[PDB]
Amino acid sequence: AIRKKLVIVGDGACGKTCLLIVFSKDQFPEVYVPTVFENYVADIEVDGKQVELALWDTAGQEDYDRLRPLSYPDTDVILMCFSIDSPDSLENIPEKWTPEVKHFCPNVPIILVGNKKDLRNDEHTRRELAKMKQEPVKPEEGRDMANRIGAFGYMECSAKTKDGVREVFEMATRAALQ
């Protein structure tokens, strides 16, 4: 297998840690959801090619501008996350996360990922957002931002129900192979 490296970036409440935990764990965390993610080396077979994909989180590094870039060396694919229940996490993508990743990871494919897609049809989420003149991120709003920032592609998933999780990591492997 060829070795590839993946790093997930995004705001503190974007759901990046939960996404890495659910993908890596063999059994879903029904008793305890871990606070942090150390690292993992996933065995993935995509389109007939065997890859060892090493997974890394940037959670905890959001406020430390000189510590955070040390996670970037030799990255082959970036998952850039936002939460669908947080339109404010989408607005930070183009002028905060995108220029940083393009500077430290030139030519590295970025997949923009909309997490917590299950909250798009959650009444509590819709009521809370409606108090700040907001609504859950629309599918076209995600695609348009991905198009604008020069992302390799746009995908959506739910770490809670597991829907879309496998497809995100299999597509990340294909991007890393290009």
Binding site: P29, V31, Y32, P34, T35, V36, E38, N39, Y40, V41, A54, W56, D57, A59, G60, Q61, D63, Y64, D65, R66, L67, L70, S71, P73, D74
Partner: protein
């Protein structure tokens, strides 16, 4: 890691580690608090273990089996002895706090009610100064270490064979040289996430909520100081490139 500690931290959580008859005797809030304290100790155990792989497996194996130029092994594993000393002592205190709290007749049933004070001690005074100086040095030498590793792996056959041999076992899957370096750099930024979640479930005793709030503040000051003290070293960087920063 030693077998005694691995078995004590083998379960996915505190609620799965203790006996179910002991678990049933506690309130949900106590269980939530204990599950996060257990994760902090379990990840500290794994972090000290990463430092042992770096010093004993990699560093020592290179000195005893390879003929590398002087000061090359130091460049690959900067501050590893100092880091191991800081974290082994911290782990010792965390493990003794759990051990003191075990019920008589049990090696697995315990509740830690007073973690805040231990965290204030670790993240204040001389021990905090040592952590700040050591991580400022380590994180400033991080890129240099990865480049030196990549150079040696590409040009030295015996170095390539040594790495492939010692990293072949399945238990080393996540612990290659470059993975260990990033695991260590990322460790310090895990602390505020763990402490904030422990604090979220430690409101029952006001003295404990206060101590954890103080510990959280101390960790953040330490991280801010480390972040401000970083400047990446580069092999062959000229003085002109440095003073024109």
């Amino acid at each position: 890691s030693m077998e005694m500690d691995e078995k004590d931290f083998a379960a996915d959580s505190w609620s799965l580690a203790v006996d179910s008859s002991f678990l049933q005797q506690h309130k949900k809030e106590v269980m939530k608090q204990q599950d996060v304290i257990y994760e902090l100790i379990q990840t500290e155990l794994h972090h000290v273990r990463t430092l042992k792989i770096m010093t004993r497996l990699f560093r020592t194996g290179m000195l005893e089996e390879l003929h590398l130029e002087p000061g090359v092994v130091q460049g690959l594993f900067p501050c590893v002895d100092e880091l191991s000393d800081i974290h082994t002592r911290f782990l010792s205190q965390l493990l003794e706090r759990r051990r003191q709290a075990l019920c008589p007749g049990s090696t697995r049933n315990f509740v830690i009610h007073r973690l805040g004070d231990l965290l204030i001690s670790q993240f204040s005074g001389p021990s905090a100064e040592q952590m700040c100086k050591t991580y400022s040095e380590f994180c400033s030498r991080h890129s240099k270490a990865l480049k030196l590793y990549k150079e040696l792996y590409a040009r030295d056959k015996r170095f390539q064979q040594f790495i492939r041999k010692v990293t072949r076992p399945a238990v080393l899957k996540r612990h290659g040289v470059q993975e260990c370096i990033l695991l260590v750099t990322q460790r310090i930024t895990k602390y505020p996430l763990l402490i904030s979640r422990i604090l979220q479930h430690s409101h029952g005793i006001e003295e404990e909520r206060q101590d954890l709030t103080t510990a959280l503040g101390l960790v953040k000051e330490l991280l801010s100081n480390v972040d401000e003290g970083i400047y990446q070293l580069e092999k062959g960087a000229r003085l002109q490139e440095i003073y024109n920063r």
